[PDB]
Write a protein that binds this DNA or RNA. Structure first.
Lengths: 85, 50, 110, 122, 97
RNA sequence: AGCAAAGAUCUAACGGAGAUAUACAACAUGCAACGUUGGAUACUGGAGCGGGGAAGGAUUUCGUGCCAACGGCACUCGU
RNA sequence: GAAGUCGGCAAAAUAGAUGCGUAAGUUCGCAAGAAGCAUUGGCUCUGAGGGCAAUUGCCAACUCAGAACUGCUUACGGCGGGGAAUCCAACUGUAUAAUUA
RNA sequence: GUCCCUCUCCAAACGAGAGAACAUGCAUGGGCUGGCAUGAGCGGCGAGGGGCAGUCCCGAGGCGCUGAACCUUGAGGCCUCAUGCUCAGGGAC
């Protein structure tokens, strides 16, 4: 169902830990870090296990549209559209 | 109210007659001063207590 | 250039225009929305609500106003005698319909 | 009310019995039948309507003969050993006219103590 | 024009108050030019001023509930809002015995 | 400053000077507001913005005309 | 969950009706609605409570209790928080209209 | 060229701001996504009950069609997935 008030992300993107100031839609600039970076926290190799694609409208309990059609399956509006055949 | 002495009724009868405006011609008397009636009255203000 | 005297009908989605409006103002404000809605697409002022459309907005009271309405919109041309510019006006009237789904908007060819 | 009632006894409610004799009501259809707005069909349907929809004790459509429904001439008659209100046949007629949607046109009004008369509006 | 005068007399002639008097909006030219009671009852007769029926207050919803409640249905323990002595005074029961 | 207790008005036709008021279309260049009638919605809720009297007021009653001032907004309405 | 604050000020809370139950103290009247426990809908039935006329026949208007089935999202308005003690006045009443009841 | 009028909402008490300027821009519809919890209507399980002589009715609930009905961008969710509207933009320096 898209990012609320934004929509689908069509182009290449950065994914960035934590909040960024400003609302959705606003232009921002990422700049090469000025603060000196030597530390365990700030030098690490990030390896992601999972990324949450569930709907942000409501409580999304489904990760993909396929996971949803498995929990429901045939449905009254679906039993209809096949009669267009 | 409905009650009234007749003596009191007349005093309001007179005061109803006196509220008429100043006649139009009486302005035209030669050497005339009176313009509008200065003794006129309205029950909403200055109540006769008769 | 679509002619004068065109009659088209369409749904207004009222539930979105009245969201969070003070209850005592719903019905009276829903009419100013329809005159403003119809007014700008027909590009006239003096938009006139028939009893059929008025009573439909009020039939649930001032608070409850129906979420949608189909309206039939008839513009016509009337000017008083000595005016410089033409004067149009529209008659917005209700078209009672059971469902809404699927209806979109279409001009009645008259 | 002496014996208390029951729901479930709302099927077959007793109706008071007219111990003296026959009672007879009339519905005079002459005027609209003349103009063709009625036809021999609708008069066959009008009698049938009362035959189907009059409810004798609790129930409708089954009238044993304590009440007889006759189309003689152009005027409908209802002869009844039971006690009915004449008001009630004015009811069924209006309820028939509203299926045919004749009711903006034909009105009924009591011409005589036992009869109604179909007519038209001014 | 103001029909305020005719509507004052047609209400006093019909014995109805307003909310029941009906002045015909089409004939408003002919309702004005009734300046008097004799002239208004000529409008009431000619159908340009009508008394409307009373609005409906129907007692039937209450007739159904009466029957149900005569079988004992809706007076329970939870539907009693007042003291026993107030619903059926123990004095009226012993006078009856 | 303010004109914020007593829920609330809406629509059409008619009235009215109060308009539909324009030096190469209509919105973008006559705004807002008034009365009556019909319709809609709502309040009072019989301890009533219901119908009659005392005290007090004394023509406010009633019909026609009328909008200068007056009814702290507006009147074409009005005590 | 009173840590707030001079102080539980304000708010919350309690709540109808029916059944059981109810302390110290006491002028034996009360205390007392002390405290506390439980029941409540909807539906389809059953029992009890009468009048009149000549054991029998016909009829009105309501209330209470009991059962079976079925339901609760605990769901209008209205409507007590309660207990342990000290000071004072016995009580109801009056009383500084406009800072003191 | 800027400002007003007009339309949008990352802005906003009013100004100001970000924007758009026949643009999937706006409108309605569809589909997503989500909330609620299975609509009206109709039809053959039900404590009991009533007629006529097993049937035909009265009856809260229940079961079937039914994760159905309804709502879903609006102070302003997604997808061009469709049609509709526009027909010389007006005015001011």
């Amino acid at each position: 169902g898209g990012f609320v008030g934004y929509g689908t992300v069509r182009n290449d993107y950065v994914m960035l830990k934590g909040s960024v100031s400003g609302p959705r839609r606003r232009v921002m600039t990422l700049r090469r870090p000025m603060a000196p970076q030597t530390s365990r926290q700030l030098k690490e190799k990030i390896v992601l296990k999972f990324i949450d694609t569930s709907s942000k409208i409501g409580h999304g309990r489904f990760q993909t549209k396929k996971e949803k059609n498995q929990w429901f399956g045939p449905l009254k509006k679906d039993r209809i559209r096949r009669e267009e055949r | 109210g409905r009650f009234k002495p007749l003596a009191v009724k007349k005093k309001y009868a007179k005061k109803m007659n006196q509220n008429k405006p100043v006649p139009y011609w009486i302005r035209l008397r030669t050497g005339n001063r009176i313009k509008w009636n200065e003794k006129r009255r309205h029950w909403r203000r200055t109540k006769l207590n008769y | 250039r679509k002619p004068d005297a065109v009659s088209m009908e369409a749904t207004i989605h009222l539930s979105k225009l009245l969201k969070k409006k003070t209850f005592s103002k719903r019905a009276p404000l829903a009419i100013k929305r329809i005159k403003a809605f119809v007014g700008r697409l027909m590009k006239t002022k003096d938009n006139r609500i028939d009893a059929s459309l008025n009573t439909y907005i009020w039939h649930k009271g001032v608070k409850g106003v129906p979420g949608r309405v189909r309206v039939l919109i008839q513009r016509k041309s009337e000017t008083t005698e000595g005016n410089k510019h033409k004067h149009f006006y529209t008659v917005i009237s209700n078209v009672p319909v059971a469902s809404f789904k699927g209806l979109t908007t279409k001009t009645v060819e008259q | 009310v002496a014996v208390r009632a029951k729901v479930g006894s709302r099927s077959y409610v007793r109706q008071k019995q007219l111990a003296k004799g026959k009672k007879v009501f009339k519905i005079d259809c002459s005027i609209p039948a003349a103009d063709g707005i009625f036809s021999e069909d609708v008069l066959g349907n009008f009698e049938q309507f009362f035959q189907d929809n009059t409810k004798l004790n609790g129930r409708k459509g089954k009238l044993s003969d304590k009440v007889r429904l006759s189309m003689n001439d152009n005027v409908l008659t209802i002869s009844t050993t039971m006690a009915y209100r004449k008001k009630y046949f004015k009811y069924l007629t209006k309820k028939f006219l509203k299926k045919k949607d004749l009711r903006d046109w034909i009105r009924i009004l009591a011409t005589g103590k036992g009869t109604y008369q179909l007519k038209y509006f001014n | 024009v103001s029909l305020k005068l005719q509507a004052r007399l047609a209400s006093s002639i019909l014995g109805c108050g307003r909310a029941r008097v009906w002045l015909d909006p089409n004939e408003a030219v002919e309702i004005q030019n009734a300046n008097s009671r004799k002239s208004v009852r000529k409008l009431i007769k000619d159908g340009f001023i009508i008394r409307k029926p009373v609005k409906v207050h129907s007692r039937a919803r209450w007739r159904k509930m009466k029957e149900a409640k005569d079988m004992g249905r809706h007076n329970g323990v939870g539907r009693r809002e007042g003291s026993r002595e107030a619903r059926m005074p123990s004095k009226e029961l012993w006078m009856r015995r």
